[PDB]
Design an enzyme around this catalytic site. Structure first.
Site, PDB file in Angstrom:
ATOM      1  N   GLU A  74      -0.058  18.266  14.330  1.00  0.00           N
ATOM      2  CA  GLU A  74       1.318  17.965  14.069  1.00  0.00           C
ATOM      3  C   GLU A  74       1.490  18.120  12.596  1.00  0.00           C
ATOM      4  O   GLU A  74       0.959  17.360  11.869  1.00  0.00           O
ATOM      5  CB  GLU A  74       1.627  16.532  14.447  1.00  0.00           C
ATOM      6  CG  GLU A  74       3.109  16.266  14.561  1.00  0.00           C
ATOM      7  CD  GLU A  74       3.745  15.609  13.344  1.00  0.00           C
ATOM      8  OE1 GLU A  74       3.976  16.259  12.348  1.00  0.00           O
ATOM      9  OE2 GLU A  74       4.049  14.420  13.411  1.00  0.00           O
ATOM     10  N   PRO A 115      -8.336   7.675   8.103  1.00  0.00           N
ATOM     11  CA  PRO A 115      -7.001   7.511   7.513  1.00  0.00           C
ATOM     12  C   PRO A 115      -6.884   8.184   6.146  1.00  0.00           C
ATOM     13  O   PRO A 115      -7.884   8.573   5.565  1.00  0.00           O
ATOM     14  CB  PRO A 115      -6.845   5.996   7.399  1.00  0.00           C
ATOM     15  CG  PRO A 115      -8.234   5.443   7.412  1.00  0.00           C
ATOM     16  CD  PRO A 115      -9.124   6.427   8.094  1.00  0.00           C
ATOM     17  N   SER A 116      -5.659   8.332   5.657  1.00  0.00           N
ATOM     18  CA  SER A 116      -5.469   8.955   4.364  1.00  0.00           C
ATOM     19  C   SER A 116      -5.874   7.999   3.252  1.00  0.00           C
ATOM     20  O   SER A 116      -5.675   6.780   3.333  1.00  0.00           O
ATOM     21  CB  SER A 116      -4.023   9.399   4.190  1.00  0.00           C
ATOM     22  OG  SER A 116      -3.756   9.664   2.823  1.00  0.00           O
ATOM     23  N   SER A 157       0.836  21.502   7.082  1.00  0.00           N
ATOM     24  CA  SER A 157       0.534  22.768   7.748  1.00  0.00           C
ATOM     25  C   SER A 157      -0.603  23.515   7.051  1.00  0.00           C
ATOM     26  O   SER A 157      -1.465  24.112   7.691  1.00  0.00           O
ATOM     27  CB  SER A 157       1.791  23.656   7.800  1.00  0.00           C
ATOM     28  OG  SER A 157       1.641  24.650   8.803  1.00  0.00           O
ATOM     29  N   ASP A 199       0.833  -1.197   0.000  1.00  0.00           N
ATOM     30  CA  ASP A 199       0.000   0.000   0.000  1.00  0.00           C
ATOM     31  C   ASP A 199       0.871   1.252   0.000  1.00  0.00           C
ATOM     32  O   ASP A 199       0.650   2.164  -0.782  1.00  0.00           O
ATOM     33  CB  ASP A 199      -0.934  -0.001   1.221  1.00  0.00           C
ATOM     34  CG  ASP A 199      -2.169   0.919   1.060  1.00  0.00           C
ATOM     35  OD1 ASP A 199      -2.477   1.397  -0.069  1.00  0.00           O
ATOM     36  OD2 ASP A 199      -2.838   1.163   2.097  1.00  0.00           O
ATOM     37  N   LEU A 204      -4.568   7.746   0.448  1.00  0.00           N
ATOM     38  CA  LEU A 204      -3.399   7.207  -0.253  1.00  0.00           C
ATOM     39  C   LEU A 204      -2.913   5.882   0.358  1.00  0.00           C
ATOM     40  O   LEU A 204      -2.128   5.142  -0.255  1.00  0.00           O
ATOM     41  CB  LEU A 204      -2.267   8.223  -0.245  1.00  0.00           C
ATOM     42  CG  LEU A 204      -2.580   9.507  -1.004  1.00  0.00           C
ATOM     43  CD1 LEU A 204      -1.363  10.425  -1.074  1.00  0.00           C
ATOM     44  CD2 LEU A 204      -3.087   9.131  -2.408  1.00  0.00           C
ATOM     45  N   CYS A 245       7.619  13.447   8.299  1.00  0.00           N
ATOM     46  CA  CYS A 245       7.175  14.753   8.789  1.00  0.00           C
ATOM     47  C   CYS A 245       8.311  15.459   9.504  1.00  0.00           C
ATOM     48  O   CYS A 245       8.437  16.684   9.435  1.00  0.00           O
ATOM     49  CB  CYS A 245       5.963  14.615   9.710  1.00  0.00           C
ATOM     50  SG  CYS A 245       6.027  13.192  10.795  1.00  0.00           S
ATOM     51  N   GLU A 256       8.605  22.353   2.603  1.00  0.00           N
ATOM     52  CA  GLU A 256       8.688  20.933   2.865  1.00  0.00           C
ATOM     53  C   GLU A 256       8.495  20.125   1.581  1.00  0.00           C
ATOM     54  O   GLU A 256       7.449  20.217   0.947  1.00  0.00           O
ATOM     55  CB  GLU A 256       7.642  20.553   3.900  1.00  0.00           C
ATOM     56  CG  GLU A 256       7.449  19.077   4.096  1.00  0.00           C
ATOM     57  CD  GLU A 256       6.395  18.786   5.163  1.00  0.00           C
ATOM     58  OE1 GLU A 256       5.175  18.966   4.882  1.00  0.00           O
ATOM     59  OE2 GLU A 256       6.809  18.406   6.283  1.00  0.00           O
TER      60      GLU A 256
HETATM   61  C1  LIG Z   1       9.811   9.693  14.598  1.00  0.00           C
HETATM   62  O1  LIG Z   1      10.772   9.765  13.841  1.00  0.00           O
HETATM   63  C2  LIG Z   1       8.495  10.303  14.098  1.00  0.00           C
HETATM   64  N1  LIG Z   1       8.062   9.776  12.801  1.00  0.00           N
HETATM   65  C3  LIG Z   1       6.698  10.230  12.638  1.00  0.00           C
HETATM   66  C4  LIG Z   1       8.769  10.177  11.602  1.00  0.00           C
HETATM   67  C5  LIG Z   1       8.133   8.324  12.833  1.00  0.00           C
HETATM   68  K   LIG Z   2      -1.458   3.186  -1.870  1.00  0.00           K
END
Ligand SMILES: *[C@H](O)C[N+](C)(C)C
Ligand SMILES: [K+]
Ligand SMILES: *[C@H](O)C[N+](C)(C)C
Ligand SMILES: [K+]
Lengths: 493, 493
Positions: free
Chosen positions: B254, B180-181, B234, B93, B183, B288, B387
């Site tokens: 977040e 959930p997304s 964001s 996925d 994607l 992220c 980003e």
């Molecule tokens: C820790 O690295 C946080 N994430 C979200 C990237 C796993």
């Molecule tokens: K996918």
């Protein structure tokens, strides 16, 4: 002799850039008694810029909680030393009785004392270890100030509400721009001089008075303000949060409500009646957590209400500075009109003014209003639903606990509730079911700085005071260190 | 071998009310390999009602944390049991290398176990007393579930990011609706079966898959949803919070970032270079918290830089199921395009594409992008500011420590940052100065469930995980009781 100040910015008194000023009206006499400066976006720009440089210096934000605590206790001491001055200035301008104002001013001192100790506790929480399940990594938590914060305070407790915000923000190491209500700004401006006398570093606290739209709204939208703390109406809270959202800026909100006081039959009626009037009529009805909806068990309803009504007659409505005074005028003509319109609509919708609803007979002038009791209430009337913020109580009866709980939770608000019953087991049951942030048991309205305060639902979110207050102004920083000097060994080389 | 599921509502599998589905694409083949239910506002309404119902029942929200912890442990065991199934699904996925998915599904199980612990310890926190100054009043704190919550999670660590929100919400005693997304929703849907098999009460968790505006936005603006937890971009966080603003509902956000890795001369280059790779290229650059801004000391930049490309060239790019895969495709055509545009734009702005910047020529299908290193950067460039969310690294030099901190903090974001120096006192200085919520010292990107996690500035606010995560889902209720049985003595009878 009402003081005349400019804005307090960077430790100096500065006139608004566009030099406008607005009147200070004594709610008792209805006529202007002085003036305050009215800041605009230009002034906010200056104050925030001053806040940010004060944050960047090496004498405040990076210092220990213990260091900032010395200033917090000095402030409390300077407040106490000048209590007479502050109490009097709070009593005119705001309109609450002299005896209310003395307790206000005593509380702003206690609040700075309490957050001074909290600042001290903050140091003991730095580099708090966090246990990891991999010996390769160690971890701790730093607690650092977020930065420059915007503090927006309401007019019902002018200095004290400001203190609830200022004190934890300073303890945390933030710097601040305070915007008090234009309805009652004089003691807040006076506070600016307290800051100079204690030698608070220039720019650490900045005080801008003015209209909401002119001074407040640009504070909230400013791109260099890291966080907003707002106390006010839910309506304005929606606007503040919507504005803060465009820069995804955090926000804490306490938004008043329509709080219930639930009274079961097994109560000493005379005592409970005294709390009931304290819950609705104290601070001239202008209590964000006012218990304005009395739910009383049908079986004692008739007796309760009658005891209630002439307790209500014995409350002396006078000028704030008069001895024995127990109800002053509401804050403004605007508020006056709105409260009278709420009363008018209540009748038009078919409720009964069991008592009051009019200006007191022995007080021709001033925004005075008799303590009003309303019965014949259906849950559909606006007076049951909307926040009146005036000395008006609503009475309804109920069958049992289920009806009481349902009726008490029947608001989109959720700030506080008070439940009264000699059965303590029953008191515990109702407390758990009430959809609110604060529950009083066998009382109504005591707010100690030691304990967390805030609402849920349309009353806002976040907790002030107690051990929660300082957390609103902190960046919780995780620090995680690889102590192995072994290769990570994920890729190949 | 890919499941065909419906929406998970009120413990059973429901066809979307307007019956839409949307495809599941293997990012490695650009092949449609299945499809997922596409929920709309009608389905949200049904899920929220189901969650409210489940919240009002006596088998979840008012039970003990000990009681709810048994479910969280059962879930952890079920996940560990079905480990092979979930890993395969996450790999096909999301496009992440199989070895990464292996660590993700282990971490899911770990997260439910840790919060089982947190649920248990919630019981020892109930009725925590708060000492008051006045012997008349007693106080304590109750920690109750807020109600029904909306959880909106990203596609880069599909099941794991969902867990980060689901685990503490259930621990707290909330009921939740998860979106959930689109994607990457397969494993999150498969999570519905885990819930049925451990016997989670129906409606306690509800999973609505579908498109952002169709399933997500209604969840956010629904009047019976008491709080939103969002992780994502964001730009979307802003719109989420703005919508929440209408009903003044609390959010945690977040929102990713542009995190710097700061590298001083006193380091072992081969080991720091590996962490630099991991901090920007791992999860196919879809982190992220990606450390996408390499700030490397001038004196060692040259060596560091091409030891970096040495390691980079050795990264096996391939189909994620292929043994040794260390980089797979990015999630979607859309993202592939945007990332390419980011690279395309940088060279138009005059940056150097030192390595990569293109699709790997041994892979003709799939959204594969070479790990890319961009040098000759001006801080004016888009690729330094925005980003990318692809396997793309920005490299800049510095002379002084002051300059490094300045460059590291020169960003509207503030999620994470990493500092490399054998000089630990210098490491400590930098960690204090960085304007972020998470600092890694001599490593990049290890996130343990034990430690709080979240950002500041435009990377959002609130802390998930550790002893912080469960508190985002609690109503902190003050309970204060007058135990004196004597008149308040404020009003004269
Ligand atoms: C820790 O690295 C946080 N994430 C979200 C990237 C796993
Ligand atoms: K996918
Ligand atoms: C205590 O009741 C809380 N206020 C702010 C109203 C004093
Ligand atoms: K006034």
């Amino acid at each position: 002799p009402i003081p005349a100040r400019q804005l307090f910015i960077d430790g100096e008194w500065r006139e608004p850039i566009k030099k406008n000023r607005i009147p200070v009206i004594n709610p008792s006499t209805e006529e202007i008694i002085g003036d305050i400066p009215a800041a605009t976006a230009e002034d906010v720009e200056v104050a925030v810029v001053a806040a940010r440089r004060a944050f960047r210096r090496n004498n405040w934000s990076a210092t220990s909680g213990a260091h900032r605590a010395t200033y917090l206790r000095a402030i409390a001491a300077k407040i106490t030393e000048k209590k007479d001055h502050f109490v009097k200035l709070e009593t005119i301008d705001s309109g609450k009785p002299f005896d209310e104002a003395v307790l206000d001013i005593d509380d702003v001192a206690s609040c700075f004392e309490y957050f001074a100790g909290q600042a001290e506790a903050l140091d003991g929480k730095q580099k708090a270890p966090v246990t990891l399940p991999m010996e390769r990594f160690k971890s701790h938590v730093l607690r650092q100030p977020l930065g420059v914060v915007g503090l927006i305070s309401p007019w019902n407790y002018p200095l004290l509400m400001a203190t609830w915000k200022i004190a934890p923000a300073l303890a945390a190491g933030c710097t601040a721009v305070l915007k008090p209500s234009e309805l009652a700004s004089v003691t807040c401006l006076e506070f600016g001089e307290v800051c100079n006398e204690v030698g608070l570093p220039p720019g650490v606290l900045n005080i801008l008075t003015g209209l909401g739209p002119d001074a407040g709204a640009p504070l909230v939208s400013h791109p260099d303000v890291d966080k907003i703390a707002f106390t006010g109406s839910s309506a304005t809270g929606s606007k503040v949060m919507a504005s803060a959202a465009q820069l995804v800026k955090p926000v804490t909100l306490e938004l008043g409500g329509k709080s219930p006081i639930v009274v079961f039959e097994d109560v000493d009626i005379d005592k409970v009646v005294e709390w009931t009037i304290f819950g609705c009529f104290w601070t001239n009805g202008q209590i964000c957590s006012a218990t304005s909806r009395l739910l009383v068990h049908e079986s004692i309803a008739a007796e309760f209400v009658d005891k209630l009504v002439k307790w209500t007659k014995n409350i002396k409505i006078s000028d704030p500075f008069e001895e024995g005074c127990r109800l002053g005028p509401v804050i403004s003509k605007g508020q006056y009109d709105k409260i009278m319109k709420f009363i008018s609509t209540a009748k038009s919708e078919g409720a009964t003014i069991l008592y009051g609803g009019s200006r007191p007979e022995h007080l021709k002038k001033g925004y005075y209003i008799e303590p009003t009791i309303v019965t014949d209430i259906s849950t559909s009337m606006q007076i049951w639903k909307e926040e009146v913020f005036g000395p008006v109580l609503c009475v309804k009866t109920f069958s049992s606990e289920d009806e009481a709980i349902a009726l008490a939770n029947d608001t989109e608000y959720g700030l506080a509730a008070a439940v009264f019953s000699n059965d303590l087991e029953r008191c515990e049951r109702i407390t758990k079911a009430l959809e609110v942030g604060a529950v009083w048991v066998n009382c109504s309205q005591p707010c100690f700085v030691q304990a967390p305060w805030g609402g849920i639902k349309r009353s806002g979110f976040g907790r002030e005071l107690g051990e929660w207050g300082i957390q609103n102004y902190l960046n919780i920083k995780q620090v995680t260190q690889d102590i192995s000097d072994e290769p990570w060994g994920w890729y190949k080389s």
